[PDB]
Structures are given as structure tokens and as C-alpha cells.
Amino acid sequence: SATGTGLVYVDAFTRFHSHPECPARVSTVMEMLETEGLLGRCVQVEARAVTEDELLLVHTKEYVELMKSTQNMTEEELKTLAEKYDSVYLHPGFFSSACLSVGSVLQLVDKVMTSQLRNGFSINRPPGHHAQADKMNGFCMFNNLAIAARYAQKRHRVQRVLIVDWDVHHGQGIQYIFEEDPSVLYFSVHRYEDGSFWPHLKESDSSSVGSGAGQGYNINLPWNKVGMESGDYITAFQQLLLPVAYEFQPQLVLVAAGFDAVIGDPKGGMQVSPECFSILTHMLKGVAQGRLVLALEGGYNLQSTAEGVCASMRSLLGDPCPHLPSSGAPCESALKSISKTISDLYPFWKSLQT
Numbered sequence: 001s002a003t004g005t006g007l008v009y010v011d012a013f014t015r016f017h018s019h020p021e022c023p024a025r026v027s028t029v030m031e032m033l034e035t036e037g038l039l040g041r042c043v044q045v046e047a048r049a050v051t052e053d054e055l056l057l058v059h060t061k062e063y064v065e066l067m068k069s070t071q072n073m074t075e076e077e078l079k080t081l082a083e084k085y086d087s088v089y090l091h092p093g094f095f096s097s098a099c100l101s102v103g104s105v106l107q108l109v110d111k112v113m114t115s116q117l118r119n120g121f122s123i124n125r126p127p128g129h130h131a132q133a134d135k136m137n138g139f140c141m142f143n144n145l146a147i148a149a150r151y152a153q154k155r156h157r158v159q160r161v162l163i164v165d166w167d168v169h170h171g172q173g174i175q176y177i178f179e180e181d182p183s184v185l186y187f188s189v190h191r192y193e194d195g196s197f198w199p200h201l202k203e204s205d206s207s208s209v210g211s212g213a214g215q216g217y218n219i220n221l222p223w224n225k226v227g228m229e230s231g232d233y234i235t236a237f238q239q240l241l242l243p244v245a246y247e248f249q250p251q252l253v254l255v256a257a258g259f260d261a262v263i264g265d266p267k268g269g270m271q272v273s274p275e276c277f278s279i280l281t282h283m284l285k286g287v288a289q290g291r292l293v294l295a296l297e298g299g300y301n302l303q304s305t306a307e308g309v310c311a312s313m314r315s316l317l318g319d320p321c322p323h324l325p326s327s328g329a330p331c332e333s334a335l336k337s338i339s340k341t342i343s344d345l346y347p348f349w350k351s352l353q354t
């Protein structure tokens, strides 16, 4: 029986930066983890730099070289290149941080799949779930979890990987990468508002269920109203994700754990209590024998994000689930979105058919 919860963090995550995506995100998460006495209960795991071969599992050779050459670029060359991407800034140390950010999750995948640890959480920036095979996007250079997913498949002989994205933003990067791939199931719960919320993509609706052999293995649930709560996410997990999850039977679960959906986040617009992420985390522990790795994505209110991380951490540590301040009943708008997605993937999953 594997035991212990891995925690990867290195000061290098704070060496690149009004802007919402800042080193303050990660530094104050670690501080709240300590003062809550959660940090000392984790097994501290070293970070490592991702190798080129590992990056090439997801990203193109030309893109990797362009990103590597950003190290020596002038702040005007970084200005030029970054302007050709959607919502992306560049920094001389972005490449190093991005490399250590990916490797941090690979470190945790190794420990969980070799049963040295039960589960893990990398407090890493830059985030990844928006990054694509040949381009930067949404403050992401490399796709942390996509790389980790195929890494586990190659190195640790994993057949099926489930990726859960509860960040308020749609991880179109992950969706694009495994679009035709049935070995990796992608689930994304995100604010959409019929395309008026960033990234403003039609591919972010529940209509996109994948293509080819990957049909049915891509699941988007789009909120079309702000102010969603814990009762909405829990109902969404209970009626959609988890039925599919147990039918899918993954051997590793990766979580794009952004916390911009927590109450008080300026960007998300939702009202999800921090304690809700303790429940969602706990649900996912019943899948893949608890083999569960979380990686930081979004979240822009420093205290709310820190609370979300702590709440997720307690469940990783096997602490009792917390009391929920909000109602257990979901709203009508949430039910509409859940119904629509279920209807869109109905013929692909037996468990959805009632």
C-alpha cells in the first residue's frame, strides 16, 4: 500500500513575471500551506528540468527550439514574439521555469506510479493547460499535464489516463493535443457564456467530443451563467464525470487544478467555496486506485487560490471532508449545461444512458 502525499515546489517558480499571473500566486500558496500545518505533512519532492525528448511527446521540434532561443532574446524580441500569441508574456527565465514546471509533474508521476507515494500536488508556475503543440497560449509555454499524461504512458506503461480540468478556463491546449487520442480522456468544466468568455472558442462547447478514434473521449461542460457554486460542480461530477470515469477505468488521474473558480477570484466570476475542491479531490481518489496527481493552473486571487490548494491538499492527505457552506442543490442553468453535455456524449458512454 502506497502512502504519503508529494509536494513539489522550487524557488525558481518565482523567477519570472499589474499582471495577474505573477510569482505571488505560488509564494503565498506555500505560505498558507505551512501556517495551516499541511506542508510539514507532505513528502517534499525535488523538481527537475524536462528533457527535450519528453517535450517532444507533445510539442513540435521547431517549437521547442524557438522556445529555447527565448532565453537569450532581448526584451524587445520577447515583446515581438509574445505579441503573436493569445494572452502571453515572455521573460528571459520563462523557458527555465516552464521546464522545471513540467518536470515537477513528471517527478510526481514517477513517485505515484512506482507506489513510493499515494498521490501528489505540484505548486508550479507557469501553468500549462492552454499550451499547444506549436504555440504559446494563455500564459502557458509547455503543456504540463499533456506531457505528463503521455510520459506516464511511455515510461510507466500506463494504458489510460484521465485528465480533469476544473480551472474556470477551457484547456483547449489539452483538448487539441488528445483530440484523436482515445487513450487519454479529457474532461473540462469551464465558464463559456456561449463563447463570450475567454478563450472565446466554439471548440469549447460540448459539441466537440473528439474526432476519429477519440470521439467520445473529449468532454466539455460549459457554464453559460456566472456565479456557479459547489452544488453545481458536485452535481456535474456525480452525474457526468465519475460515471464516465469508472467506465473508462483510468490508471492515472491528472488534474488541471486551477482555482480561479473559487469565490472572490476577479477572473473566474464563479462562487465555488474552497471546501468544494476537497470534495472533488476526494471523489477522484476513488478512481485509479487513488493514483492522483494535481498541478497548479489558474487562480488570481492570492488567498482564494491558496485556500483552494489547501482544501485540495487535506483530501490528498486523507483528512475528513469539510462542511459545505453552500447548498447541495444545483441551479437550473447548471442542470441545463449538464443535460446538454450528457446528451452530446450519450451514445459513447453506457453509464450516461438512463
Ligand SMILES: CC(/C=C/C(=O)NO)=C\[C@@H](C)C(=O)c1ccc(N(C)C)cc1
Pocket (backbone or CB within 6 Å): 020, 087, 088, 127, 130, 138, 139, 167, 168, 169, 198, 258, 260, 267, 297, 298, 299
Ligand atoms: C489568459 C487568462 C487566464 C487564463 C487562465 O487562468 N487559465 O486557467 C486571462 C486573460 C483573459 C486575462 O485576464 C488577461 C490579462 C491581461 C492580459 N494582458 C495584459 C496582455 C491578457 C489577458
Ligand SMILES: [N+]
Pocket (backbone or CB within 6 Å): 165, 166, 167, 168, 169, 170, 171, 188, 189, 190
Ligand atoms: N477547465
Ligand SMILES: [N+]
Pocket (backbone or CB within 6 Å): 178, 179, 180, 181, 182, 184, 185, 186, 210, 214, 217, 218
Ligand atoms: N481525448
Ligand SMILES: [Zn+2]
Pocket (backbone or CB within 6 Å): 167, 168, 169, 258, 260, 297, 298, 299
Ligand atoms: Zn484559468
